[PDB]
Design a protein around this ligand. Structure first.
Ligand SMILES: Nc1ncnc2c1ncn2[C@@H]1O[C@H](COP(=O)(O)OP(=O)(O)O)[C@@H](O)[C@H]1O
Ligand SMILES: Nc1ncnc2c1ncn2[C@@H]1O[C@H](COP(=O)(O)O)[C@@H](O)[C@H]1O
Ligand code: ALF
Ligand SMILES: [Mg+2]
Length: 203
């Protein structure tokens, strides 16, 4: 089974993907997590991607396409979390998979309004050593866990990221609808309820 999680920044895609992957054995491919690792390591990819990410812009397609060619699991279940994020990325994914006799089985759209997105992102905090994600209101970190606010979760950068999503990523909703594989979830609900809806799709 190959899944794509699609939706605005802060919709809860990572939160749900991490759980589904552990509980059901999917390989989790988060382009954001992988890119943040590259930046830390200072690889050619990381050094180039950094300033796009800091501005809330997308990293250029060719870099992301190469990244996915390099890490795409040969066999077994996969969740692509935050990839694809452009039409050209989605076209590349389809081509890659077809060469392997595979296809995307379901694309889960995490629907949530802007006001909710903005609250989730402005209260998001991360453990920079593990990538674990918390929320100051909805899931605060316990004692002993040092967390930070991502630079891209600043108010002006959140604004830009939502703009970028609407212009470049939201067209994927129609791209996948027209493949017959889009499934809608209400990602504005609390975490447990979102997860129930995820399980319903993949079942
Ligand atoms: N259903 C939910 N309700 C409330 N807060 C949530 C929910 N899902 C995730 N969060 C919190 O909202 C923020 C965004 O979640 P995250 O999984 O990082 O989203 P994404 O991967 O889509 O950008 C995080 O701070 C997370 O703790
Ligand atoms: N598929 C992608 N294409 C382009 N840039 C991406 C992609 N995934 C992550 N990014 C970059 O990483 C940032 C964080 O994304 P994420 O961690 O998925 O919320 C984005 O705002 C982009 O700068
Ligand atoms: F996957 Al995001 F901000 F959209 F961590
Ligand atoms: Mg994420």
């Amino acid at each position: 089974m190959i899944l794509v999680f699609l939706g605005p920044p802060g919709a809860g895609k990572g939160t749900q993907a991490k759980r589904l992957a552990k509980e059901k054995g999917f390989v989790h491919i988060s382009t954001g997590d992988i890119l943040r690792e590259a930046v830390q390591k200072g690889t050619p990819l990381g050094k180039k991607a950094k300033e796009y990410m800091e501005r809330g812009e997308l990293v250029p397609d060719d870099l992301i396409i190469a990244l996915i060619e390099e890490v795409f699991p040969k066999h077994g279940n996969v969740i692509f979390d935050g990839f694809p994020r452009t039409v050209k990325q989605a076209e590349a994914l389809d081509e890659m998979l077809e060469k392997k006799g595979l296809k995307v089985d379901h694309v889960l759209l995490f629907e949530v309004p802007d006001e909710v997105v903005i609250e989730r992102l402005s209260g998001r905090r991360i453990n920079p050593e593990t990538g674990e994600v918390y929320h100051v209101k909805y899931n605060p970190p316990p004692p002993g866990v040092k967390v930070i606010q991502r630079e891209d979760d600043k108010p002006e950068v959140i604004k830009k990221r939502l703009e970028v999503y609407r212009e470049q990523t939201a067209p994927l909703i129609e791209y996948y609808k027209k493949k017959g594989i889009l499934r809608i979830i209400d990602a504005s609900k609390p975490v447990e309820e979102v997860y129930r809806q995820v399980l319903e799709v993949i079942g």
